[model samples]
Structure formats: C-alpha cells, structure tokens
Target: NPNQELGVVQCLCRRIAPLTQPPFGVRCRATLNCPCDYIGDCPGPAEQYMYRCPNCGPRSHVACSGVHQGTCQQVHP
Candidate 1:
C-alpha cells in the first residue's frame, strides 16, 4: 500500500573505512539521514539490530554508491 507507510525503511549496513583529514580523503562528510531502524538484518531469526554509523567513511559503500564516514557510535533516539 503506497499510502500505508509502516515503520522505518530498511537499508543495508555499509562497513565504514577509516578516514584521514582533508587533502587525503575526498569531501565525503555527508550527514546520514537514515532513520534509526536502518541498520541491518539478522541471521537465522527474523530479528534485527538497530544501529547507525554516524558518517559514511571515505571508502564506504551505501548499497552500491560510495560515501563519507563518521562514527562507530550507536544510532539516534
């Protein structure tokens, strides 16, 4: 149902790569606006862990596209 917006949308977790200061990494410090529930899926069981990588690392892949990186901190509220 297009009109039936359920819970948050799911997104694959992009493993972040370590980044250096400017002049080394590209301008990839983009804010991750993904909802708190977009972490990843669980194996065996149909459960998932709610986590969020604050930033997309310099060599991070969002599904397919590469983006900047941020933190290993937990997700938003």
Candidate 2:
C-alpha cells in the first residue's frame, strides 16, 4: 500500500506471505486472525482491511467497516 490519502488496498499488505514489516513500509503482512471489513470473510486470493495509521501496531488494523458497506476501500491506488 503506497502512501496516499484515501488510497485503495489492492495488496493492503494484509497477507505479506514471506515478509512482515521487514522493510518498515507503511503496510505489513496480515495474519489469519487479522480484522476484516467484510461481513463474513475477506475474498481469498485477497482480503479487505482497516485504515490503520502508519507506525501503529498490528492491532490498529482492526476490521473497520468499509464506506461502501458491502465492500471496502482497498489500498489499490
């Protein structure tokens, strides 16, 4: 997730696979128990997340409800 206001979360750094904040980027790998903005589950092959401030702990990314309700504003942008 690049730095940008109201940016989308294509790879919100939610599931960073082999890496986790290794480079200290604004985004990090999301754990299985990570919060999800969706109702049931975040679409696999991908996922949704909360708007956490930079430098905040993992807990910051708590499942925040997306503005769209059904979906969330991904950091894709």
Candidate 3:
C-alpha cells in the first residue's frame, strides 16, 4: 500500500578532510537526510551535497543547501 518513506532524499558527502588540521591527507564520509527533489540527477530522486565532517565539531562550515559534487572540508581546532 505504498508504505515506504517518501519526500526524503539521501545525500552523500565524500572526500571529507580537515582544512585546519595536520591530518589533511585523511578523507571521510558522511550521510545526510534532506528534502526530496532538492535538485536533480542520480536518475531517480537521490541527491548529493557538500558538508563538513559532523564529527569535526561546530567549527566546520555549514552543510550545503543545494546539490554539489566535490570534496568537503572541516575546520579543526
């Protein structure tokens, strides 16, 4: 009866690194929940965006509001 989740999109944030830390060579991933049909692409409804490592604390930049395809950076203190 169409009991699956809808109007929700799964966003992927990859190549995450620390821009203010020495461990700049490291990369990470973070998954985020966003509003459906936020942008386009993925041939379905899934989308992608830029975001800072959630574990990097609040010093990191705020997550992107639109669809994006690139690396992410975090500001470590």
Candidate 4:
C-alpha cells in the first residue's frame, strides 16, 4: 500500500536593503507557515519564490517582490 504523510512547510520572506541608508529606512520581514501533502520527495532547502508583503502594501518597491525561501519537514504524531 502507498503511504501518505502530512508535512509542515515554512517560508521566510526578507526585504532587500539598498546601499543608501535613510533615517526611516526600516526593513520588512515576514514568515509564512502551512501544511502540505508529501507523497515521496519533499521540497528542497534552496527552493525560493516571490512573495508580497502586507506591510509593503501596493507600492512599487523591492520589498514588494521579496524573495521567500521555504523548507519542508515531515510531521509525526
């Protein structure tokens, strides 16, 4: 019989900083965690995707298209 398992996946999004520094230039950071179905192979450590931050709103900035890297691990109960 085939085995099915539930895994916990997490993504960490970090804003890219610019060379110039400003008085109110604060960086944005967020994390997204969700459950996923794993049948055979899980996701890799270097897997990354684009994610938009709520704090960035709809503005056109580097933070808007932040790079998010994810990790997946099996969960046992």
TM-score of each: 0.17, 0.14, 0.17, 0.16
Q: Which residue pairs show backbone clashes in model 2?
A: 8-74, 8-75, 8-76, 9-74, 9-75, 9-76, 10-75, 10-76, 14-30
Residue 7's lDDT in candidate 2? 38
The 0-to-1 C-alpha lDDT of every candidate, in the order given, reads 0.30, 0.32, 0.31, 0.31
lDDT of 3: 0.31
Candidate 3 Cα RMSD after full superposition onto the native fold (Å): 18.4
Higher-TM-score candidate of 1 and 4: 1
Q: Give lDDT for model 1.
A: 0.30
Which tens-of-lDDT digit does each residue in 12-60 have in candidate 4? Answer: 3344422222222224343433255423322223222233334443223
Better of 2 and 3 by TM-score: 3
* Full-model lDDT, candidate 4: 0.31
For every candidate structure, what is the RMSD over all alpha carbons to the true structure, in angstroms? 18.9, 13.6, 18.4, 19.3
Model 4 clash pairs are: none
RMSD of 4: 19.3
- After the best TM-score superposition of candidate 1, give how far the Cα of residue 75 lies from its true spot, in angstroms: 34
Query: Largest lDDT belongs to which candidate?
Result: 2
